[PDB]
Amino acid sequence: NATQINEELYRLLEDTEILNQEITEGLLKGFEVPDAGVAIQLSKRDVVYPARILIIVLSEMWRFGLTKQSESFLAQVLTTIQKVVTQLKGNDLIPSGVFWLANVRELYSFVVFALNSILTEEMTDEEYKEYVSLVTELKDDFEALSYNIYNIWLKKLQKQLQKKAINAVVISESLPGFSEYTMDDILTFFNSIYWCMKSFHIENEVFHAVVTTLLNYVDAICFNELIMKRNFLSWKRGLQLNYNVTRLEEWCKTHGLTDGTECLQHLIQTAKLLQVRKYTIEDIDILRGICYSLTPAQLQKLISQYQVADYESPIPQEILRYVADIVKKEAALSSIFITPETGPFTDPFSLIKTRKFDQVEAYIPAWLSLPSTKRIVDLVAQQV
Ligand SMILES: [Cl-]
């Protein structure tokens, strides 16, 4: 009976005390991410199950005109999701962050869809006014949420790289003995971003933005460490740096990026500088063309700090003064560090068309224990 289903639905939805607690503590804070990787085939419903559940609840509240209940519910949802992303850390950081990006994108896409449906197809006409106004604000709130959690997450990713990439790129020996975190750890990290985004059906533009931002970041912070080191830069260190950096560049090539080489140019060009001949004037003129991303002052620091090995010819004084003169020259034509980009960053989701919404069957997973929420979804499902 439609009326009995409607009455029961109505009482479930007006009882926001019980419902908000279920949603915020059980569904949102209690989220479980599905597995990601090469042999994994996830349906979209396994990835965005929290968003789809929220969408069912939300729309039922609107259908019954529980506009005040929806506002209460939504404020809790917005706060909780942002809070959840703020608390992400450790091994879970990449999959949980991508998970929440997917879900907030699904929510935002729904609201965009609902707003267009309201304006196009659709009890006081002044209540309708307040309604359009509510959904419009909700669209802005989810846009802000997406931006916020994208930036919160991306900053946490940068810090994990500040922690690992410097040791892996600059310090760890690709050739042990030649001269904690290794390039393998760095590759694992970027692979995890790749496979979580792939498996969780994330739009490729977003993958491009995230990884380009992080590669530029690795480039800046590792370069800055390298250029301060005064008893370290040498041919051997250059060969090892080459092997570390090339591995990251080759990963970029097989994982959809064509601009990875451009993001790593300061590291790549430093490795070259550390390896090529630095003995004649022409050597230096050639080196300048190879190192087109390095300033003369940077060339000078790197060259003047270069450490010759036993049986290796010293860099001649003639060449050191040539370089110093190129620096004093270009100075007379009016930092050595690269400023790391720390944001905030444009939300790459905001640049692409939203998910066109096809109405999907009411579904709520099995490990969940959400009595009211599950009854709502079951009752909605019965009306179909
Ligand atoms: Cl992973």
From Swiss-Prot:
Region described as Non alpha-helical, tail domain: 1-384
Phenotype for residue 96 to G: Intragenic suppressor of MYO2-2
Listed result of changing residue 312 to G: In MYO2-338; abolishes interaction with YPT11
Domain of life of the native organism: Eukaryota
Domain Dilute: 75-329
Substitution effect: residue 302 to S: In MYO2-338; abolishes interaction with YPT11
Compartment(s) where it occurs, according to its Swiss-Prot or TrEMBL record: Bud neck; Bud tip
Effect seen on changing residue 361 to G: In MYO2-573; causes a mitochondria inheritance defect
Subunit structure, interactors included: Homodimer. Interacts with calmodulin (CMD1) and the myosin light chain MLC1 through its IQ repeats. Binds to the membrane receptors SEC4 and VAC17 to transport secretory vesicles and the vacuole, respectively. Binds to KAR9, which transports BIM1-coated cytoplasmic microtubules that are attached to the spindle pole body into the emerging bud, thereby correctly orienting the mitotic spindle. Interacts with YPT11 and MMR1 to accelerate mitochondrial distribution to the bud. Interacts with SHE4 and localizes it to the bud tip. Interacts with RHO3 and SMY1, putative regulators of MYO2 function.
Domain comment, as recorded: The myosin motor domain binds to actin.
Function field: Myosin heavy chain that is required for the cell cycle-regulated transport of various organelles and proteins for their segregation. Functions by binding with its tail domain to receptor proteins on organelles and exerting force with its N-terminal motor domain against actin filaments, thereby transporting its cargo along polarized actin cables. Essential for the delivery of secretory vesicles to sites of active growth during bud emergence and cytokinesis.
Family: Belongs to the TRAFAC class myosin-kinesin ATPase superfamily. Myosin family.
Note in the entry: Present with 4339 molecules/cell in log phase SD medium.
This protein's name: Myosin-2
Source organism: Saccharomyces cerevisiae (strain ATCC 204508 / S288c) (Baker's yeast)
